[PDB]
Scaffold this active site. Structure first.
Site, PDB file in Angstrom:
ATOM      1  N   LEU A 194       8.431  10.113  15.600  1.00 26.45           N
ATOM      2  CA  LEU A 194       8.678  10.416  14.037  1.00 26.45           C
ATOM      3  C   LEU A 194       7.055  10.123  13.470  1.00 26.45           C
ATOM      4  CD1 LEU A 194      11.554   7.982  13.141  1.00 26.45           C
ATOM      5  CD2 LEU A 194      11.439  10.612  12.945  1.00 26.45           C
ATOM      6  N   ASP A 199       7.193   6.315  19.637  1.00 22.63           N
ATOM      7  CA  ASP A 199       8.631   6.392  19.969  1.00 22.63           C
ATOM      8  C   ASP A 199       8.811   5.541  21.470  1.00 22.63           C
ATOM      9  OD1 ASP A 199      10.957   7.444  18.373  1.00 22.63           O
ATOM     10  OD2 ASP A 199      11.433   8.383  20.358  1.00 22.63           O
ATOM     11  N   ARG A 227      20.522  -4.743   9.676  1.00 18.93           N
ATOM     12  CA  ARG A 227      20.292  -3.214   9.211  1.00 18.93           C
ATOM     13  C   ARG A 227      19.394  -2.527  10.028  1.00 18.93           C
ATOM     14  NH1 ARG A 227      17.591   1.287   7.363  1.00 18.93           N
ATOM     15  NH2 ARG A 227      15.992  -0.063   6.738  1.00 18.93           N
ATOM     16  N   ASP A 229      17.196   0.475  11.509  1.00 13.98           N
ATOM     17  CA  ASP A 229      16.326   1.308  11.086  1.00 13.98           C
ATOM     18  C   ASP A 229      16.468   2.902  11.952  1.00 13.98           C
ATOM     19  OD1 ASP A 229      14.073   2.484   9.246  1.00 13.98           O
ATOM     20  OD2 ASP A 229      13.552   2.252  11.486  1.00 13.98           O
ATOM     21  N   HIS A 327      14.907   1.981  -0.864  1.00 14.82           N
ATOM     22  CA  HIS A 327      13.422   2.320  -0.681  1.00 14.82           C
ATOM     23  C   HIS A 327      13.272   3.624  -0.521  1.00 14.82           C
ATOM     24  CE1 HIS A 327      15.722   1.636   2.749  1.00 14.82           C
ATOM     25  NE2 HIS A 327      14.895   2.320   3.522  1.00 14.82           N
ATOM     26  N   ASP A 328      14.188   4.555  -0.039  1.00 14.90           N
ATOM     27  CA  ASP A 328      14.031   5.885   0.320  1.00 14.90           C
ATOM     28  C   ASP A 328      14.111   7.103  -0.592  1.00 14.90           C
ATOM     29  OD1 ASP A 328      12.842   5.573   2.702  1.00 14.90           O
ATOM     30  OD2 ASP A 328      14.887   5.415   3.566  1.00 14.90           O
ATOM     31  N   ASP A 577      44.135   0.475  12.975  1.00 17.41           N
ATOM     32  CA  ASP A 577      43.631   1.243  14.200  1.00 17.41           C
ATOM     33  C   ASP A 577      42.143   1.186  14.495  1.00 17.41           C
ATOM     34  OD1 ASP A 577      43.193   2.284  11.505  1.00 17.41           O
ATOM     35  OD2 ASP A 577      43.037   4.322  12.404  1.00 17.41           O
TER      36      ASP A 577
HETATM   37 CA   LIG Z   1      13.278   8.031  18.900  1.00 18.39          CA
END
Ligand SMILES: [Ca+2]
Ligand SMILES: OC[C@H]1O[C@H](O[C@H]2[C@H](O)[C@@H](O)[C@@H](O)O[C@@H]2CO)[C@H](O)[C@@H](O)[C@@H]1O
Ligand SMILES: OC[C@H]1O[C@H](O[C@H]2[C@H](O)[C@@H](O)[C@@H](O)O[C@@H]2CO)[C@H](O)[C@@H](O)[C@@H]1O
Ligand SMILES: OC[C@H]1O[C@H](O[C@H]2[C@H](O)[C@@H](O)[C@@H](O)O[C@@H]2CO)[C@H](O)[C@@H](O)[C@@H]1O
Ligand SMILES: [Ca+2]
EC number: 2.4.1.19
Length: 686
Positions: A194, A199, A227, A229, A327-328, A577
């Site tokens: 990214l 990575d 949370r 990311d 934040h995005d 369910d």
């Molecule tokens: Ca990745």
């Protein structure tokens, strides 16, 4: 404890989350502030550190800012140690103030505080009934350059002070070396870097094990949720194996970030939320709310459609985390805009299904474009704003009105600009009216509701020009005028006599783990819990109250189950369910099949002997598999979560629509590792 207690780490539906950028909130301890070129005490330079920290947070908790607002959980920046280099991005200097540039997942970011500051954070919060959530960003480390090892920290990864490795000369293969993604495909954005972020390779055992261990520490530290990311950027199967690690240890509510653009609706997104073990940030909700109340690029009919659809698309809609900004995105409020839009959007959000999140400063009407403009420092801690008061009146209903926390959603009245919806759960109702039209009032006639006969006062007390309501018999409301920009909340609560399950968590775990069942009408006497047809009573039920039950998953076979409860008198509840019973602890294994050529619109899938593999049911096969990056067609691959140390039989299949073609021969076989990962490579049998 009751479903609403601060100690309920499995359910956030009754909570209101306050999202904080640690650096930008409150600098309670100037002594940990970075120095020199990495610091800007005026916080005019949005890319450096401003000095906000754990202590500051603790202070805001204690001086009543957050509690006064009715907030009950806080979601903070990733607390792990970040790189220390300042990075110049073509003239501009950038620091890791955000906390997304990890260097060692077993340590704290010293600008935020020490382990001891972290612990105080947890204590103060808990003392004030506030749950704590942290960001966790295991997709990568930091920005690296493979041939310029001197750039930043070379994506260096440490294990509690110990150097594991760097991006340059990665002989261990800790990272991926496939280039950068163009976001062109899903496979593309998972196995490539990214941007320039290093990575992590989850298929490497060291990495795998390392992350699973790191998260346990924080869990041990007492966090209430996670949370995640970049979940759309890591292997689905790996992530599922990580969820099992959490759940089989110390379950906490976990939600990931899978960005959706305007009008974007993704089936991959749905599936991930329904099967991964975690829920998601509700972008679909967010984008739609903005179009309707912000940009006016869609109307009520659009909002209504998002609501009905999403209820059908997500198996556990009530677990999606909603918001109006974060934040995005640019801040909801625009400098020159009518503040009423923001207020209405807040009110809408607070009273809608899911887990509401509030981006810090919203209540202050902060404006700001994209990053880093949306990350400014909170200009003030006034409780005098209207937004502050809106949240203050509505937040608490999530705790006292289960219609809000777990009820269904139903359109009762609608036009282009107006929307009246009803939330219902047991003998609890909530009715919300919204008139986006800031210039025109609306004549509301024919409104029918589930409220009992009587008169109702606007829960907001007229704050957003709401009015009173008059319900006659049959629940039909009498005609009324809904003010321009009008917003009203009406409600009715009463005791539920029958057992009604409102929520369950975690939704996936191996036998023996304790799950939490929330709702109403369970009575005070232990009843029975059903896992499918299997009955559980007595000792295994570790706790039972009217609103909450704690029970251990019986040792049944891996699979999907429906949950239902019966009170002491034998009255049964509604079913809940999609519960997944794992076959045991999980490992992440990469499956590779060679020479599986397909026809257009035909994909390879995987199936096999365990529930984790669909148990031979093609309708439940794993896939479609990948064939671009790591391996190239006609070679196909895929990372999958499987029961550890088990001997598994499997086969591949080619599917087109619902038409299936089986691999020939006999089942392939293998035994899953006891820990770590593995790679199975085989050839397609004709
Ligand atoms: Ca990745
Ligand atoms: O009367 C029941 C009826 O109420 C609502 O319909 C509204 C409609 O949304 C308004 O646009 C306007 O036409 O008034 C109608 C009521 O007369 C519900 O939307 C509808 O489903 C329901 O049957
Ligand atoms: O990229 C995945 C892609 O794979 C499958 O298509 C094969 C196709 O069957 C072959 O004839 C050949 O031309 O290569 C394609 C892969 O590049 C699926 O048919 C397709 O839906 C899928 O996206
Ligand atoms: O139905 C369970 C059964 O599924 C698989 O059997 C396949 C077989 O491999 C195929 O060649 C084809 O004949 O369809 C069968 C499905 O009925 C598993 O191979 C088998 O072990 C399992 O019992
Ligand atoms: Ca500080």
């Amino acid at each position: 404890a009751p479903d609403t207690s601060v100690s309920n780490k499995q359910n956030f539906s009754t909570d209101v989350i306050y999202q904080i950028f640690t650096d930008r909130f409150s600098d309670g301890n100037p002594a940990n502030n970075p120095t020199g070129a990495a610091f800007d005490g005026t916080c005019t330079n949005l890319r450096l550190y401003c000095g906000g920290d754990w202590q500051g947070i603790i202070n805001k908790i204690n001086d009543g800012y957050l509690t006064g607002m009715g907030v009950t959980a806080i979601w903070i920046s990733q607390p792990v140690e970040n790189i220390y280099s300042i990075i110049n991005y073509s003239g501009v200097n950038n620091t890791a103030y955000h906390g997304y540039w990890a260097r060692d997942f077993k340590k704290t970011n010293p600008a935020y505080g020490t382990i001891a500051d972290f612990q105080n954070l947890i204590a103060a919060a808990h003392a004030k009934n506030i749950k704590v959530i942290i960001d966790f960003a295991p997709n990568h480390t930091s920005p690296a350059s493979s041939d310029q090892p001197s750039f930043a920290e070379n994506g260096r990864l440490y294990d509690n002070g110990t150097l594991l490795g760097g991006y340059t000369n990665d002989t261990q293969n800790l990272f991926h070396h496939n280039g950068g993604t163009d976001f062109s495909t899903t496979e593309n954005g998972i196995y490539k870097n990214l941007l320039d972020l290093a990575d992590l390779n989850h298929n490497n055992s060291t990495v795998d094990v390392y992350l699973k261990d790191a998260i346990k520490m924080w869990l041990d530290l007492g966090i209430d949720g996670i949370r995640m990311d970049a979940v759309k950027h890591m292997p689905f199967g790996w992530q599922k194996s990580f969820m099992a690690a959490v759940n089989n240890y110390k379950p906490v509510f976990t939600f990931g970030e899978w960005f959706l653009g305007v009008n974007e609706v993704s089936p991959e997104n749905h599936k991930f939320a329904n099967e991964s073990g975690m829920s998601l940030l509700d972008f679909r909700f967010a984008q739609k709310v903005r179009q309707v109340f912000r940009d006016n690029t869609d109307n009520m009919y659009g909002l209504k459609a998002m609501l009905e659809g999403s209820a059908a698309d997500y198996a556990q809609v009530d677990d999606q985390v909603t918001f109006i900004d974060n934040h995005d995105m640019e801040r909801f409020h625009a400098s020159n805009a009518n503040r009423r839009k923001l207020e209405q959007a807040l009110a809408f959000t607070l009273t809608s299904r899911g887990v509401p999140a509030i981006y810090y400063g919203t209540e202050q009407y902060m404006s700001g474009g994209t990053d880093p403009d949306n990350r400014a420092r909170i200009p003030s801690f006034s409780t005098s704003t209207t937004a502050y008061q809106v949240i203050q009146k509505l937040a608490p209903l999530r705790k006292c009105n289960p219609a809000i926390a777990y009820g269904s959603t139903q359109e009762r009245w609608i036009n282009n600009d107006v929307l009246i919806y009803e939330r219902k759960f047991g003998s609890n109702v909530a009715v919300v009216a919204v008139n986006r039209n800031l210039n025109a009032p609306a004549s509301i006639s024919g409104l029918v509701t589930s409220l009992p006969q009587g008169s109702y006062n606007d829960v907001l007390g007229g704050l957003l020009n709401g009015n009173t309501l008059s319900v006659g018999s049959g629940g039909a409301a009498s005609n009324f005028t809904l003010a321009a920009g009008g917003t009203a909340v009406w409600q009715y609560t009463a005791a539920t006599a029958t057992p009604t399950i409102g929520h369950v968590g975690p939704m996936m775990a191996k036998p023996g783990v304790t799950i939490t069942i929330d709702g109403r009408g369970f009575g005070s006497s232990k009843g029975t819990v059903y896992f499918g047809t299997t009955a559980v009573s007595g000792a295994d039920i570790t706790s039972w109250e009217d609103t909450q039950i704690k029970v251990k998953i019986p040792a049944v076979a891996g699979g999907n189950y429906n949950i239902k409860v019966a009170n002491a008198a034998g009255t049964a509840s509604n079913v809940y369910d999609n519960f997944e019973v794992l076959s045991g602890d999980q490992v992440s294994v990469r499956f590779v099949v060679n020479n599986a050529t397909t026809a257009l619109g035909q994909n390879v899938y995987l199936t096999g002997s365990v529930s984790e593999l669909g148990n031979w049911d093609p309708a439940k096969a794993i896939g479609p598999m990948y064939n671009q990056v790591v391996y190239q067609y006609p070679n196909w691959y895929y990372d999958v979560s499987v029961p550890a140390g088990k001997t598994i039989e499997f086969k591949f299949l080619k599917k087109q629509g619902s038409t299936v073609t089986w691999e020939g021969g006999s089942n392939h076989t293998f035994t899953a590792p006891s820990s770590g990962t593995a790679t199975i490579n085989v050839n397609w049998q004709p």
